[PDB]
Design a protein around this nucleic acid. Structure first.
Ligand SMILES: Nc1nc2c(ncn2[C@@H]2O[C@H](COP(=O)(O)OP(=O)(O)OP(=O)(O)O)[C@@H](O)[C@H]2O)c(=O)[nH]1
Lengths: 70, 843, 73, 79
RNA sequence: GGAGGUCAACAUCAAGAACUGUGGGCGCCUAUAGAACUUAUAACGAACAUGGUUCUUGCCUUUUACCAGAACCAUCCGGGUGUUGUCUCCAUCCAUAUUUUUUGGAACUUUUC
């Protein structure tokens, strides 16, 4: 159990997350969890109106995680 | 094509997984891998591969009833009669195999069996040139020695990941019969010893960089491999992983809870011994010592294993091997450990970059192939290449280049050969291939003619892509040949056959140099006795069918001196004065060591293409080198170093610049040869003191004048600087029992050099490590003198590292000393005697 | 337990999922989560069909199991 | 368990899958997990609408996966 | 049926891939014969003796004697296997209600074709 996922290669890089309720977020990947709870900094919503926030996303919610730039 | 395949398929001995999945897997760059196997003499290498082979193949065709059971180790990859009869691996034979791992994701693995005899290090270098990582196999009894240090040094130097295997553990327990408490200690010592030479990384039976095995018997361990297989079932999975961290070094568990405290309370042991070594011992004791009925209960109780009576009806050794292979299943601990130990991103740019300039441009969509070794298979000569990029297929027209040419770096440049076929090595058979993809190593038919030894294979469709492309650097073999044989055929009329054969030998043996004398005699250089012996055997048997005369083993000498010039052109307009100087041993050593100047390491002069300020910085930093002289370093020779040093360098530097290459070309030309014996010069620095130039240079300063003039001046300078001869020396690694020491001492005295650099008790065994040095000219037969005088006990290896030529005793130029023919030269002069015998051969 | 589940091995099965879709094919591998592996699979969304091949379903997704035919030789 | 090892063995090949989302993803698989996480490249998504897109890198949660679709040679693999 | 038979008879006898011929069974498989290549002549026997011929060493130029090398053939003492008839003895896979599966984000409504 508790296989600590392979998110070492995403640390301190920009992301394009998707979550439950078709809502999505951009941010710098700070830290991750056993259950895939995430720490994002410089968090910006994608409503198309983009609101700056500054965030801990829950693990359950997460659908996926992308990279903007190669 | 299909017909060929159908016939071919019958030949090969089929396998359990099948080719199709193994062929199927290839496309991913990440999937699959390249691994080489090295280690000192009889470390087990070949038999380790044999283990994998026997796991994979159901038949096997070759096995005798006898061998399959026990006593004679089956040898695969020893497909050469010479090797079989000699009994030691000589020429490397690949095995390619679809292997599973603990995760259950199979990958294709290219394995390379390299020879561990010190004379065939060249073979190891060739393997390394292709392999991603290396498995270094150490005998638990032998421990580590000089060749191990050399091997790890080079391996890491070339960014080859290193995973250790400590083999013959059974011997430690059965041969030496060591107690478990002491056994652990001995292993730990070995582990420590490897680590100190290694820099920046630290292993441990807990990082899974070290594997424990007995090839002979039939088993391989990692501390991970064991825990999952037997312990894991016993306890909750979450906890177990930690168990391994609490398994190695300083950890004891009293009764469910384990405390780092020494062993308070009564009976005590650290865990490794508790859960591993003790039961292993019990297995040994229990199988041989125990009634065969008793054993069954334990197999069902402890292991859930059930043997038939036919498994009991063997004998101690074959029974034991059966049981160990029974309990410890296919060697996937090994495979798994390999799998999760290499990261492509970290090494790969570094390993590619070193062979080639850093670049990099036009990546992808382009064919690229490094050709290393060539292979004398049943049919013809095959070419072995590493799929650097793209894809190969049958009949593909491929451009081919040879490295020395590359050294050099449009129409005329490109020769090409179509690729007739590609096969995948499997020791004794070759599996037919339609196409080859980047990552893998393959056998090519028909690319051979373009290249002798190494070559770089590329296909470029692009003019910019072509410009970017960097040719692979010449492989740097670990040792220099030194040993010298003169050949002539028995009957002179058969010369053409000899000539052909010699060329073939150059293709097959990367360490051989064939030179042709005025006389038509053939000078052969090889690394050492055994090496050359094998060449001669193949030459007389396999290639030429001609009986030939062979001379008395000699050695290549080197010229030198220890501390002014006047000179005149054939058309007296030029006049040259050049100083000749002894060089600092530090400097010499720095030059001998091929390096990039990385870490704190003194920069290798071949880094001269970098800013002279930097080059001069190194000289000033490491030597307190004169600032003008350091700035005036022109170039190195084919060896030592050239400096500009006079007022006319300021008077007419532009004029002088026009003549640099003519000088530059000449000097390699002049130093490559020599005034005493036409032999190359060492430890000598030259400084231009004066250069007169013809009034109005009416195309007067021609290469036809100055090149030979310069050459002459060098020769004169060397002579007036008091020349000496240098002789190459081996490092003598001798392993013996203590009371045989005095014998060894006497042998050294008798040979000539009689020098022993160090004596080290081999902790854990009844053996000494003896390091000495010996003059190659006095080396003929040395090894047999040892073997015979010690009554078969102990052994010797001669290895050329450091490549240091010591001053030959006597003055280079005195007539008086020598005494008549057939008498070994008196000690006062070995320099004068050496010149005359060589002098006569020159003319 | 899982004694019954091994008995189903290598039979053509009709598996209804939470989505309503129904997969069909032989059963090669089975789990404690009820992860099923199925060979030569065909969905029937409903007058419809699709060819997939090897399909690995989760436990969350599966509703019911039912044998279509006996084990093949 | 075998239903997880089969997955790990299709790493490298191209895979199709379905999520609770409703969309299907297709691409080369780089890494998997016992959880059923995934890491893929050059993905070609196709939702309920039919809308195609490109995603360079992706991570997933297994909980969100419905089912996978795996290459054909992965039926001769050992169980 | 079984073990053992110091009982015999009759066959063969290193192993392996590949060519040709014959026979049987439904292009494939099995058996037998011949030729070529490999292993190391790993050994049919962890033993090893005599003789014939042809050459090359010593000889009285003679032997029913030899010296000590070579090649080619033979004999002799043994061994294995199958088969057939006999003989004696004996029987006829772990247990988790709190984030990646099994203690639910479900429930419900409406419009379009
Ligand atoms: N006692 C013992 N010896 C072993 C074991 N494994 C290998 N050896 C030794 O390895 C030798 C045979 O192994 P080979 O693989 O043929 O030799 P090698 O390691 O290939 O040697 P090279 O060909 O020179 O590399 C035997 O003489 C053994 O002494 C082991 O587990 N126990």
């Amino acid at each position: 159990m508790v296989s600590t996922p392979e998110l070492k290669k995403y640390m301190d890089k920009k992301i394009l997350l998707n979550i439950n309720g078709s809502r999505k977020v951009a941010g710098i990947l700070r830290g991750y969890d056993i259950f895939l709870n995430v720490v994002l900094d410089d968090a910006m919503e994608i409503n198309a109106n983009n609101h700056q926030l500054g965030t801990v996303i829950r693990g359950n919610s997460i659908i996926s995680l992308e990279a903007l730039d190669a | 094509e299909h017909t060929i395949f159908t016939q071919l398929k019958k030949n090969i001995p089929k396998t359990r997984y099948n080719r199709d999945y193994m062929l199927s897997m290839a496309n991913i760059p990440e999937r699959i891998i390249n691994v080489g196997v090295i280690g000192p003499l009889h470390s087990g290498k070949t038999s380790l591969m044999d283990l994998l082979v026997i796991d994979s193949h159901k038949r096997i065709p070759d096995m005798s009833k006898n061998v399959e059971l026990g006593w004679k180790p089956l040898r695969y990859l020893d497909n050469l009669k010479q090797e079989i009869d000699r009994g030691l691996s000589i020429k490397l034979n690949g095995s390619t195999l679809l292997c599973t791992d603990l995760e259950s994701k199979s990958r294709m693995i290219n394995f390379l069996d390299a020879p561990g005899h010190v004379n065939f290090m060249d073979e190891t270098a060739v393997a390394l040139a292709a392999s991603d990582l290396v498995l270094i196999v150490i005998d638990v009894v032998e421990g580590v020695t000089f060749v191990v240090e050399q091997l790890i040094k080079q391996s890491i130097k070339n960014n080859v990941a290193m995973c250790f295997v400590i083999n013959k553990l059974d011997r430690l327990i059965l041969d030496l019969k060591l107690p478990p408490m002491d056994a652990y200690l001995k292993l730990n010592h070995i582990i420590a010893n490897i680590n100190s030479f290694t820099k920046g990384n630290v292993f441990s039976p807990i990082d899974n960089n070290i594997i424990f095995a007995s090839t002979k018997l039939g088993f391989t361990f990692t501390i991970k491999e064991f825990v999952s297989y037997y312990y894991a079932h016993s306890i909750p999975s979450s906890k177990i992983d930690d168990f391994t961290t609490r398994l190695w070094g300083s950890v004891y568990y009293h009764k469910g809870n384990f405390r780092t405290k020494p062993f308070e309370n009564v009976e005590k042991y650290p865990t490794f011994v508790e859960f591993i070594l003790i039961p292993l011992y019990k297995i040994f004791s229990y199988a041989l010592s125990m009634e065969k009925d008793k054993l069954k209960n334990l197999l069902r109780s402890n292991f859930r294993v059930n043997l038939s009576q036919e498994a009991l009806q063997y004998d101690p050794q074959p029974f034991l091997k059966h049981v160990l292979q029974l309990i410890f299943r296919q060697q996937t601990g090994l495979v798994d450990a390999i799998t999760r130990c290499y990261q492509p991103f970290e090494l790969f740019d570094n390993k590619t970059a070193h062979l080639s300039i850093p670049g990099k441009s036009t990546p992808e969509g382009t064919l690229w192939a490094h050709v290393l070794k060539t292979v004398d298979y049943g049919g013809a000569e095959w070419s072995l290449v590493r799929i650097y990029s793209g894809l190969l297929k049958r009949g593909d027209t491929v451009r081919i280049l040879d490295t020395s040419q590359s050294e050099s770096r449009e129409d005329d440049e490109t020769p090409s050969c179509e690729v007739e076929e590609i096969g995948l090595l499997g020791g004794r058979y070759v599996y037919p291939v339609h196409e080859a993809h980047k990552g893998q190593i393959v056998l090519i038919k028909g690319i051979s003619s373009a290249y002798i030894k190494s070559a770089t294979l590329y296909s470029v469709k692009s003019k910019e892509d072509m410009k970017q492309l960097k040719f692979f650097k010449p492989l740097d073999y670990i040792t220099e040949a030194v040993f010298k044989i003169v050949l002539q055929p028995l009957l002179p009329r058969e010369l053409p056959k000899l000539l052909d054969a010699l060329n073939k030998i150059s293709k097959y043996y990367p360490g051989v140099i064939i030179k042709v004398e005025e006389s038509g005699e053939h000078v052969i250089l090889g690394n050492g006795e055994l090496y050359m012996d094998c060449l001669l055997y193949d030459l007389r048997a396999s290639y030429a069918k001609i009986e030939i005369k062979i001379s008395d083993p000699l050695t290549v000498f080197s010229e030198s001196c220890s501390n002014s010039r006047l000179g005149e052109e054939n058309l007296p307009g030029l006049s040259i004065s050049v100083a000749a100087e002894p060089m600092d041993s530090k400097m010499i050593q720095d030059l001998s060591r091929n390096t990039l100047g990385k870490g704190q390491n003194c920069l290798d002069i071949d880094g001269i293409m970098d800013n002279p300020r930097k080059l001069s910085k190194i000289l000033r930093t490491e030597y307190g080198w004169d600032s003008l002289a350091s700035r005036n370093v022109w170039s190195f020779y084919n060896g030592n170093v050239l400096i500009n040093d006079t007022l006319p360098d300021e008077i007419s530097p532009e004029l002088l610049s026009k003549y640099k290459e003519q000088i530059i070309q000449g000097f390699y030309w002049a130093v490559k040869e020599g005034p005493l014996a036409e032999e190359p010069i060492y430890g000598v620095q030259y400084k231009l003191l004066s250069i007169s130039v013809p009034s109005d240079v009416n195309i007067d300063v021609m290469k036809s004048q100055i090149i030979p003039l310069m050459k002459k001046a060098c020769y004169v300078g060397l002579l007036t600087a008091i020349p000496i001869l240098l002789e190459p020396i081996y490092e003598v690694d001798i392993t013996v029992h203590a009371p045989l020491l005095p014998i060894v001492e006497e042998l050294m005295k008798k040979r000539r050099g009689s020098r022993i650099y160090k004596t080290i008790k081999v902790a854990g065994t009844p053996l000494l490590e003896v390091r000495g040095q010996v003059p190659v000219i006095e080396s003929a037969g040395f090894e047999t003198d040892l073997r015979l005088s010690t009554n078969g006990l102990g052994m010797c290896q001669l290895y050329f590292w450091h490549k240091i030529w010591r001053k030959v005793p006597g003055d280079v130029l005195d007539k008086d000393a020598f005494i008549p023919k057939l008498k070994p030269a008196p000690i006062n002069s070995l320099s004068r005697d050496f010149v005359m015998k060589t002098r006569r051969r020159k003319g | 337990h899982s004694s019954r589940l091994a008995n189903l091995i290598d039979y053509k099965l009709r598996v209804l999922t939470q989505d309503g879709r129904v997969y069909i094919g032989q059963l090669m591998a089975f789990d404690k989560h009820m992860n099923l592996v199925l060979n030569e699979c065909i969905e029937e969304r409903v007058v419809e069909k699709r060819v997939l091949g090897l399909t690995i379903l989760r436990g969350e997704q599966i509703l019911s199991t039912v044998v279509e035919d006996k084990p093949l030789l | 368990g075998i239903p997880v090892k089969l997955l790990n063995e299709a790493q490298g090949h191209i895979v199709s899958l379905e999520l609770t989302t409703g969309a299907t993803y297709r691409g080369k698989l780089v890494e998997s997990e016992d959880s059923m996480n995934v890491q893929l490249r050059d993905v070609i998504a196709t939702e309920p609408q039919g809308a195609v897109t490109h995603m360079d890198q992706i991570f997933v949660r297994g909980s969100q996966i419905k089912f996978i679709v795996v290459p054909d040679l992965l039926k001769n693999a050992p169980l």
